[PDB]
Write a protein that binds this ligand. Structure first.
Ligand SMILES: OC[C@H]1O[C@@H](S[C@H]2[C@H](O)[C@@H](O)[C@H](O[C@H]3[C@H](O)[C@@H](O)[C@H](S)O[C@@H]3CO)O[C@@H]2CO)[C@H](O)[C@@H](O)[C@@H]1O
Ligand SMILES: CC(=O)N[C@@H]1[C@@H](O)[C@H](O)[C@@H](CO)O[C@H]1O
Ligand SMILES: *[C@@H]1O[C@H](CO)[C@@H](O)[C@H](O)[C@H]1NC(C)=O
Ligand SMILES: *[C@@H]1O[C@H](CO)[C@@H](O)[C@H](O)[C@H]1NC(C)=O
Length: 606
């Protein structure tokens, strides 16, 4: 269709499937295996990307061009990599992925939204969609085209370090929150075929339903471990939200490090190809987790040739290597040259990768848009995060006896108030893991508003606000305070570092609450990724709020404390009486919660 030098795959007016087939038919084996290879930015250079025909790059958690990098620094990084990829013989653009899992959370100055457990507390799928919309914009601000989200794990044991990445122990809530997908990618057309990939264009991102399947069902919440459940339970609890993701056109699916009845997901042909591809009719691409193929073996990485065979034959399309690309490419080439992996499997993987890249517009807009840089941390997005944070809060207690005056909402005008606790003026702690660093961090790590700063911004000008991180009882009794707001809870964590069998918060936390509440009426704000042992905190406190990991906009917390809005959040998980009960989920025969799933007290706006 025209010029002498016309190449059909480069023609934007042609159907995606025609462009895929036209390009596939031109590729060498090295070109094909290169599309299946994703590498870390830390190992990428122009020559590596060209010479190995690389298909994708990622930033792992904390993998940034430099601390404090601007949106344009990110765009320039990504474009540098893309220029190299575009300079190959076929000029296939790379796709760049990142964990934008509560905002564009690796990036300094990005809006940090509540983590998923708090989002579940909102029961507001439209809010979550709008969060997906804002997050796409902040990701494209940085030149990145692909977010490894949503995590649609259904966490069945809060001892898991990734429980905060699950919207709920109730699959029905997780299913509802799959609205993140069309937020991130755009809404699918009216005609759309379930399982096809979809991204609207250059102002949206490819999404990733993860981690397939039963990541949230592992024994004792041990991360990456075995999920022991019959097929009926897998399909009833862990699978449903993947079908909603198909219906919404999720572009990619990432495989779980976990096993199902002792079979590594990364080696599970029956589920990856038999179920996801052949039964759900998924037509986007399937990506490994980080060194997920390595971890098929024990020790990990001890037979990488077998890891490559098993994973590729199972149906994986793209391998998050992410470092040892030369070994991956060599081994895979060897297996194909040997007949161990058929060209048909290679061609299927490449068809799927290309289908996503053409669908999303990546061949038409391979480079960043500098005009999008100002989306990063935009105030409209922060207002959205503030709404989400406030909606996420679950009021557990509001008065020690039935006859007491309710403590919340608090008055904005009082002579002197106390704000205390380890978590009252610590932005990193209120964001939790996957913020700036992989594991999160402590202190003022990005742009945001701490609880203390929020209180100062809310109160009447006549109200004196005193901060004391860990005051003793006498200090409180002597201070002439009207009330105190005390914030405590978990430190940031991610993945296996968060696995925790006792679920008690670090000290000083309880001791501070006890000292404060012992001297003045107190509202305790509990920052956590999950339910934690709470009876002692409750016994001490007049009011207690489960604020989860509310992100960068601490004013969401004070919006509800001071009565600008009423408390509306409801527990998305069971709150256990003790960890010896676990696992214990809504609907179990032996259900004895401290607070059941769906519990939450309310207030009315002042
Ligand atoms: O981020 C991509 C997908 O990967 C994993 S998280 C992944 C971190 O992103 C990555 O930084 C981290 O690398 C560490 C290795 O685990 C360690 O074994 C070595 S010593 O060092 C680096 C620490 O720099 O590895 C993590 C996986 O363990 C998630 O499961 C996915 O949800 C995420 O999309
Ligand atoms: C009361 C108690 O023992 N708490 C522990 C804490 O010391 C430890 O860091 C964590 C690791 O999982 O588990 C919990
Ligand atoms: C589960 O973790 C145990 C305890 O660390 C370990 O020995 C085992 O290999 C793990 N199982 C799987 C399937 O990951
Ligand atoms: C809050 O509003 C509800 C619904 O009208 C009402 O029934 C309740 O009495 C109100 N409580 C307070 C403290 O204002």
């Amino acid at each position: 269709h025209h010029a002498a030098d016309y190449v059909l795959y480069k023609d934007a007016t042609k159907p995606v499937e025609d462009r895929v087939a036209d390009l596939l038919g031109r590729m060498t084996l090295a070109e094909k295996i290169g599309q299946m290879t994703q590498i870390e930015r830390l190992v990428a250079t122009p020559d590596v990307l060209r010479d190995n025909f690389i298909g994708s790059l990622l930033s792992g958690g904390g993998s940034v061009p430099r601390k404090g990098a601007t949106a344009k620094e990110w765009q320039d990084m990504v474009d540098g990599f893309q220029k190299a990829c575009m300079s190959t013989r076929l000029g296939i653009p790379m796709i760049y992925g990142i964990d934008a899992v509560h905002g564009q959370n690796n990036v300094y100055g990005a809006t940090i939204f509540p983590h998923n457990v708090g989002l579940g507390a909102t029961r507001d799928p439209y809010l979550v969609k709008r969060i997906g919309e804002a997050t796409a914009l902040e990701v494209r601000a940085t030149g990145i085209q692909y977010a490894f989200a949503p995590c649609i794990a259904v966490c069945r044991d809060p001892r898991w370090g990734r429980c905060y990445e699950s919207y709920s122990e109730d699959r029905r809530i997780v299913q509802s929150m799959t609205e993140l997908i069309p937020g991130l990618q755009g809404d699918v057309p009216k005609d759309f075929t379930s399982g096809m990939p979809f991204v609207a264009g250059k102002n949206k991102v490819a999404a990733c339903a993860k981690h397939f399947v039963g990541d949230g069902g592992t024994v004792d919440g041990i991360n990456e471990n075995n999920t022991i459940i019959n097929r009926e339970g897998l399909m009833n609890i862990h699978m449903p939200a993947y079908k909603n993701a198909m219906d919404k056109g999720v572009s990619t699916v990432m495989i779980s490090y976990s096993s199902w009845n002792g079979v590594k997901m990364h080696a599970n042909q029956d589920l990856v190809t038999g179920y996801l591809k052949d039964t759900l009719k998924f037509k986007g691409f399937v990506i490994s987790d980080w060194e997920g193929i390595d971890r098929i073996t024990t020790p990990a990485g001890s037979d990488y040739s077998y890891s490559v065979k098993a994973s590729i034959l199972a149906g994986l399309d793209m391998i998050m290597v992410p470092n040892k690309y030369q070994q991956f490419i060599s081994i895979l080439t060897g297996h194909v040259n040997g007949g161990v992996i058929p060209m048909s499997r290679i061609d299927d993987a490449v068809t799927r990768i290309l289908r996503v890249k053409f669908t999303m517009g990546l061949f038409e807009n391979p480079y960043a848009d500098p005009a999008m840089a100002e989306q990063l941390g935009k105030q409209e997005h922060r207002d959205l995060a503030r709404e989400a944070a406030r909606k996420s809060l679950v009021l557990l207690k509001n008065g020690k006896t039935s006859t007491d005056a309710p403590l919340l909402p608090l008055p904005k005008k009082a002579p002197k108030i106390l704000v205390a606790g380890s978590h009252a003026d610590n932005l990193g702690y209120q964001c939790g893991g996957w913020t700036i660093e992989f594991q999160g961090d402590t202190g003022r790590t990005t742009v945001g508003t701490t609880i203390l700063e929020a209180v100062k911004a809310a109160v009447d000008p006549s109200t004196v606000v005193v901060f004391a991180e860990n005051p003793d009882a006498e200090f409180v009794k002597s201070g002439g305070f009207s009330y105190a707001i005390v914030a405590v809870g978990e430190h940031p964590y991610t993945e296996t570092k968060g696995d925790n069998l006792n679920l008690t918060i670090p000290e000083p936390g309880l001791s501070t609450v006890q000292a404060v509440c012992g001297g003045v009426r107190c509202a305790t704000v509990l920052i956590s990724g999950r339910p934690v042992v709470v009876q002692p905190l409750l016994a001490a406190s007049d009011a207690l709020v489960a604020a989860w990991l509310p992100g960068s906009e601490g004013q969401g917390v004070t919006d509800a404390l001071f009565g600008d809005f009423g408390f509306t959040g409801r527990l998305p998980r069971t709150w256990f009486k003790s960890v010896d009960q676990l696992p214990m989920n809504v609907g179990d025969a032996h259900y004895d919660p401290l607070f059941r799933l769906g519990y939450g007290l309310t207030t009315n706006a002042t």
